[PDB]
UniProtKB/Swiss-Prot annotation, chain A:
Cellular compartment(s): Plastid, Chloroplast stroma; Plastid, Chloroplast membrane
Induction, per UniProt: By red, far-red and blue light. Down-regulated by white light.
Tissue and organ expression note: Widely expressed.
Organism field: Arabidopsis thaliana (Mouse-ear cress)
Coiled coil spans: none
Boundaries of the shown chain within the full protein: 994 to 1376 of 1381
Note: Plants silencing CHLH show significant ABA-insensitive phenotypes in seed germination, post-germination growth arrest by ABA and ABA-induced promotion of stomatal closure and inhibition of stomatal opening. In contrast, plants over-expressing ABAR display ABA-hypersensitive phenotypes.
Subunit architecture: The magnesium chelatase complex is a heterotrimer consisting of subunits CHLI, CHLD and CHLH. Interacts with GUN4, WRKY18, WRKY40, WRKY60, CHLI1 and CHLD.
Knockout mutant characteristics: Pale-green phenotype with low survival rates during de-etiolation and severe embryonic lethality when homozygous. Chli1 and chli2 double mutants are albino.
Record-given protein name: Magnesium-chelatase subunit ChlH, chloroplastic
């Protein structure tokens, strides 16, 4: 179809410039070699391909509309125009993106392979730098090594990490990560259309191991990172870390497209802003308390989604949980209101606090943990 | 006479900069425990500044008698302090121990005194922790409030710098076990009876640490000019002892300036690399100094690996830029080989070691090149 449109590309350029600028600034003026990112299908419908267009800017290509107005090829941007190296990308497409944007997965894969093959210095073309190394490691052609457009298999959705977090059914982060790798390692191949979304787990792991940055786009005024579970479910931050030889956590960012000028913030900063707007905001939680039974369920879900981000990124700082404990548990007026309003959901909140502590996401006093366990025993006797 | 009134005053400024930095990162929550190192020569030179910093952290003032002898403390009231008393794990160097046994006694007595104050636990983190530790260990609160540690009499260092020099270590756990074995000797002002191993309390106190801290005068001796600073760095040690495996925030107070600037350890590493290992003015001057100059480059790289092993705070680009600078700025390889093949071989082992141990992530071609160079060397 027509995407990304000229308008989408103009917005995309600005966001990518801001992301790269911030990363270069935080890391001794150095460009990141690979950005691991997520593309959401509904987003790209609404914006006519803005986040898709961001990938094109990262690698330094521009979309070209044909005589019928359809975007089905790209042309490389010159290194002089780009003004920096081409940055490699691991493109984690959501299941909805895959269902709705086959032609654009084709566009992206073709674009990335074409970039890999440009006769350019590897220090100016990180797609080629990595694809050459991966081709040598695996003994495959450079175009095969330059596979970056991934998703769930046809008919599958999510990493099932939000499902595991909801059920508290998992033992360690490695289990969540192994599930992400098993579920989201299906690749599009524009050189072999008839193959569908085909498993390329070795290349997926190698490409992820090169990532120095993780990135998603959100409109926080519409749907915040904790309003839903799907954003943490697809977050590749800890996954990348676990695949790197150095076990270095990549720098994590979120582009917030609330305002016309989209703000690139760290994931940590995004968590902070959201906690101050939602979970720990008196106007929000009192509003929920005024909504009674269902309001308490919303508070419970918010805390659960926060733990989700801990599990996938480690970017929820201790103060979020400590302040949540002070607000909801240590304040007896609120504690009693919660227990009386929705005992079942309050019990789940207690479990979530205890789980955050047990899993190593929240450090707190022995007395605070004892209080939670007392309240658990008490609410179970009530139910 | 140590710490003097002037040393105590200088100390407060640095303590406040440190705690305010961490408080900011914590959205207003003060760090509950700082694990730090005290150096002996430093405290002689400054008349007890870094020792005085510990006294300010816990909120006590040293008191001089009619002979000018600084031989007890009095608590600063919580109201006058205006923030919580911060718990401290005081890792005294062996030289500090040799010079300042009386001050180790003073400090232990001060910390035990603070632990027993009738104060809110959220305003007195020494007491907060000591109460939990007394219960867990089945000991009295004063015994639980043991925080002043060193090497055993006649011993020095964690032997970590020795291990790093010889590459005679399996993993970070081995280094950490050595630190725990060597540096868990506690001074007991209630016992006079010499030193005693207090490994259980040491581990528990370290496990509460949220910050690590040392004072350096980077204009005189940088963190890589010598090996003793990384040898005593408790950063990864603390992390390993925590249930949550959270790395404490690591800082260095640089006393180059009139009032020390508090920087992250990672920033301190970055500044030093730009000043030394990766500074053309430095390494070419080393090259001009013959055999010994190459040995200095080798040692500098080794000390950098030391900091990786103890803290994880050496950014990848340090090793990457070192490779760009020393390896394959074409003549460089051969010059190192020709000026000092023994040291050049050690540099190759070090680069390969940094990659092998997961401290340096780089291109497969960079690794291959280092291999080829080694074979040639
Ligand atoms: Mg979009
Ligand atoms: Mg999906
Ligand atoms: Mg000093
Ligand atoms: Mg020593
Ligand atoms: Mg700093």
């Amino acid at each position: 179809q027509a995407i990304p449109t000229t308008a989408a590309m103009a917005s995309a350029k600005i966001v990518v410039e801001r992301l790269v600028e911030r990363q270069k600034l935080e890391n001794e003026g150095k460009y990141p070699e690979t950005i691991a990112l997520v593309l959401w299908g509904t987003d790209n419908i609404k914006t006519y391909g803005e986040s898709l267009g961001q990938v094109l800017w990262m690698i330094g290509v521009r979309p070209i509309a044909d005589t019928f107005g359809r975007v089905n090829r790209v042309e490389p941007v010159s290194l002089e125009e780009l003004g920096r190296p081409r940055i490699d990308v691991v493109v984690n497409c959501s299941g909805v993106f895959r269902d709705l944007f086959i032609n654009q997965m084709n566009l992206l894969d073709r674009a990335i392979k074409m970039v890999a093959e440009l006769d350019e210095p590897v220090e100016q073309n990180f797609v080629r730098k990595h694809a050459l190394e991966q081709a040598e490691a695996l003994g495959i052609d450079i175009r095969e090594a330059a596979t970056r457009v991934f998703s769930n298999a046809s008919g599958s959705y999510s990493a099932n990490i939000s499902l595991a977090v909801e059920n508290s059914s998992w033992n360690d982060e490695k289990q969540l990560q192994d599930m992400y790798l098993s579920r989201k390692s299906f690749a599009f191949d524009s050189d072999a259309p008839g193959a569908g979304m085909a498993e390329k787990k070795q290349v997926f792991e190698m490409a992820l191991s090169t990532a120095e940055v993780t990135f998603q786009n959100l409109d926080s005024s519409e749907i915040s990172l904790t309003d839903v579970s799907h954003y943490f479910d697809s977050d590749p931050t800890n996954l990348v870390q676990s695949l790197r030889k150095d076990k270095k956590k990549p720098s994590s960012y979120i582009a917030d497209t609330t305002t016309a000028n989209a703000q690139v913030r760290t994931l940590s900063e995004t968590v902070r802003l959201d906690a101050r707007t939602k979970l720990l905001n008196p106007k929000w939680y009192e509003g929920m308390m005024s909504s009674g039974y269902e309001g308490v369920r919303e508070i419970e879900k918010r805390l659960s989604n926060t733990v989700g981000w801990s599990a996938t990124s480690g970017q929820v700082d201790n103060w979020v949980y400590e302040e949540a404990n002070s607000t909801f548990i240590q304040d007896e007026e609120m504690l009693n209101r919660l227990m009386n309003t929705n005992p079942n959901s309050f019990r789940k909140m207690l479990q979530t606090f205890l789980e955050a502590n047990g899993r190593g996401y929240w450090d707190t006093s022995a007395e605070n943990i004892e209080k939670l366990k007392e309240l658990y025993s008490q609410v179970e006797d009530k139910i």
